[PDB]
Design a protein around this nucleic acid. Sequence first.
RNA 1: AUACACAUUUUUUGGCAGGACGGGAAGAGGAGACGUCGCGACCCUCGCACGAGUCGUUCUUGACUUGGUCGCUUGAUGUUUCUUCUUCCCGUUC
Lengths: 70, 82, 212, 92, 84, 170, 77, 73, 72, 75
Amino acid sequence: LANLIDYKLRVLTQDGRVYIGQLMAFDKHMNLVLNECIEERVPKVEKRVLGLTILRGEQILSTVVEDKPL
Amino acid sequence: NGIPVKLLNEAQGHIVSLELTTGATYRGKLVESEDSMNVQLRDVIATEPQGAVTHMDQIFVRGSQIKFIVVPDLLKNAPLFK
Amino acid sequence: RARDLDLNEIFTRDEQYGEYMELEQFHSLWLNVIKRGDCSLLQFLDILELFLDDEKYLLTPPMDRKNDRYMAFLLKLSKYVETFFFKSYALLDAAAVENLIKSDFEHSYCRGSLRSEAKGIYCPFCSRWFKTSSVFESHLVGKIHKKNESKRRNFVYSEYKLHRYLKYLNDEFSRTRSFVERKLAFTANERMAEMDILTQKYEAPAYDSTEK
Amino acid sequence: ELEELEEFEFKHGPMSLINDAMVTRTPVIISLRNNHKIIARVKAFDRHCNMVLENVKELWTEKKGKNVINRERFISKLFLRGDSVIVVLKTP
Amino acid sequence: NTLYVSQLNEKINMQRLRVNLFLLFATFGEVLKVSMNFKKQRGQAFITMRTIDQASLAQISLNGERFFGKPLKVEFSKSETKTL
Amino acid sequence: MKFTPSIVIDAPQYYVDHFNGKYNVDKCVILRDLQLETDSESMPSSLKHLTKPTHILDLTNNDLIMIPDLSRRDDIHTLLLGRNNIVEVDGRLLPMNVQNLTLSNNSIRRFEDLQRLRRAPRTLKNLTLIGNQVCHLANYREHVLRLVPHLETLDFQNVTAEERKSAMSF
Amino acid sequence: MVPPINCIFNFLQQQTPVTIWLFEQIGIRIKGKIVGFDEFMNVVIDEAVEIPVNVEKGTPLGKILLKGDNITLITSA
Amino acid sequence: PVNPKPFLKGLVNHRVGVKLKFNSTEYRGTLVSTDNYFNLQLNEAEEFVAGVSHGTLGEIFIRCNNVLYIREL
Amino acid sequence: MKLVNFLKKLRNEQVTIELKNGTTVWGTLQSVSPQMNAILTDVKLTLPNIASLQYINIRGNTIRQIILPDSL
Amino acid sequence: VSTPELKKYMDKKILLNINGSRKVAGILRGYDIFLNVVLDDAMEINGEDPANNHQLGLQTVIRGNSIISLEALDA
RNA sequence: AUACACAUUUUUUGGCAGGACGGGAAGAGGAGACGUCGCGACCCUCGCACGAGUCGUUCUUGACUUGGUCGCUUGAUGUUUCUUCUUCCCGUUC
Ligand SMILES: [Zn+2]
């Protein structure tokens, strides 16, 4: 997971919503802080710019490498 | 403690937005954040999944119930880049 | 010219570039087909052996050759064996082989290629024998045989292919069956180390920095 | 001492079903939370009811545009999480 | 490296203004600025450019260009951009 | 000279300002997925090594004659075509969700040459033709509106129902 | 202004009939007397009754050990 | 104090039935044993779904987590 | 003992993980965390139409079951 | 185990919203490490419109794990 | 550089249940709330700095405080209740 740091990553939430943002830090619970994170729902349609977010590890399903870091 | 917990403690005194497991959104000034993610919030504007919006003075939600928070970008500078 | 050519995208690890053919998967599907568990990997291979014979797979079928599940399975398996065959022998003209088999199918197989001194002439499509060649010929125009040859053509042909391709691969079939028995008679540590070996062979450069 | 007491409690407790399953190599059927069922032999288990199962046959129930049909498949080497377990039945 | 533009139709939303500005000024060189910091519109946009020659070329070539109904006025910024 | 994959691999690749993502194209010349600027691109080709991760394509300052030879790119939203010599447009462009096209300062002469832009389904919201000879021809604006009503903003001016109706009247 | 465990303890002593609201279930709620509890809030409840709200009926269950996880809201009636 | 653990120990070796949170399944059988985390082992078990007998399961294990309550029968 | 260690042994193994949400995963285990968080490469993934992904990390609690090779 | 800093809320009337879209109102009595709460003068607000005084003085207990959130009616 | 992570806030869970297509328009027998971000403008407003504002020391850092409104003249979107045909044009496929 440490390798994934600073990358643009795609997390899938527990509710099916897809979040995309830079991975700044993690923790034990897999709580993630995502910089410049935006939300996509259906697939672009229904995209919103959230900004800096924490996500809770209890909600996270999976993560995948989206793009390289800024 | 978690590094994100440390950030969230830095977020105190700022305006944050919270989405809970129900889906309601609470925007307002975060008074206090415990290690367990329990948060005390002020002057909250709430938007329900139906779209209805309410105002409330003081709100305190359990950590476990929070889906996610958005905090201001001021904090993004440091010291979590390390 | 072929710098982006990769065998691992053509062969699975259990096939070891043509050393073995992975039939465990088909053993699974087979269990699903027979609707039980009385069938072991080795008993399944024992079943496959039928298709090395020119008559067994026809006159001593594992299941009734008009069963759906069975015919579907046989299709999938046949396809696998064929692709494996040409996959493991790139250098031989695929089209040549294909046409050879097809012509053998048309000129002999469907022409009473299976003959018995007692029962006469067997027909793959109707699964019946015939006294003499005469009644056999006048049966190849009958509404029955028309129906069958018109419905079960693809299956019959696929069966046949499974037959001849498995014959051409007898050495690989035996090699694998052997492998099965070996792994089966291993211990835990043994089986583990062996798997390690197959893996290494799979993810190793085709040319070592230390070759002559 | 503590380890001993843990293994013993495990032995005479409800776990005795899955312990018995591994030692006898007997088939057991597992009702899961996915509304799928797994009949198999117990290769290994865990305090969380994490399991390694062999000769797996999972049965399930599917609805279509007509009568409900049961569907089933064979998975020879199956590892299973411990929270999916609703119930583990041991039977002749 | 940064150019100060003003006299623009403020009726355009922020994100569309920024996307059209980046679009228009990409012809001279890479625009480094992602977003208008000033968040007040009324023309007052700053465009940051990686090389200086692209800033000068944009300034001379796009003076008084009709952009969303209005001829834009372009000048060099008083101070250096934080990102530079 | 040619846009080839060897070039595709190693240009200044980064994220747009707009946070639009991409991976750029410069072994010695013309680029893609970011800054396709100033390396004398004659004909677009070999977009496949772009392999889809790109929101934007800054083609400006090349010698492009026409816009064909676009592999299927789902991700590409913005094309910055400025300062080329685009005479014609392909037609079967249809890269779904191409929202923005920048034709500024090119050489598209005829109204009819603009026809292929109608194919862009409902995504081509922003199109800028300013700097072309076709702009001078009579009823240019109205013909673009009647031809591609999908455009929401033309030449950085917004469509408006008034000239939509005038475009209907003629 | 008393901890909930002491509240439950006074339910224990008073032997009052108790109504529990379960988790994520509005349809049914359980009722009966608290004869004992543990640290996990599992409760032995005597003369317990299932009360479907959907006039109300119910099923007499007798003695019950109810797991504390279901517990949403413990009350007195 | 009479704790759930002693009540349950006294309930061992007795005919019981257990209603799960789902209520989709109840199990009636002899209570063989229960552990400190309260997983349940029953014998001769019978499954009652929607209050009707589904079938006779026999020696059965119940994950603690699924248990809504247990009652003696 | 701890089966999670048995998963730790499973690096470079090709597996099909069914998940509690019903999702199917297919890929080579690069590592599994003790949380049973599984990192895989060369993964085809089917949500309940397959998406092909270079690397996928999964939170362990979401994993329903993992189907291992029979050769193991 | 941490204790929730609920002292500021003590002896205040609060609207608790709870799982299952349930909502109750009552004066915050006690709490514990577990976030379990004692509420006096508890009143259930059913989904319809009426409200029932469940625990006027007898007081109720709400498991903290079920407590979605808590609003302060007073200041 | 070299024991533990199943009993309330995180990972051992309250979860489960010629033919077709796709637009856009017309003619006949989808429509109400409640929100949240956009095309235009008769409007507001009028400017270089922001994250902003001040100071100590030195050629660059450390401390301390704290688009909004109206239309859409058929813009885009998630609750949540209730009850299709025909014709013409433009794209894909065979
Ligand atoms: Zn015949």
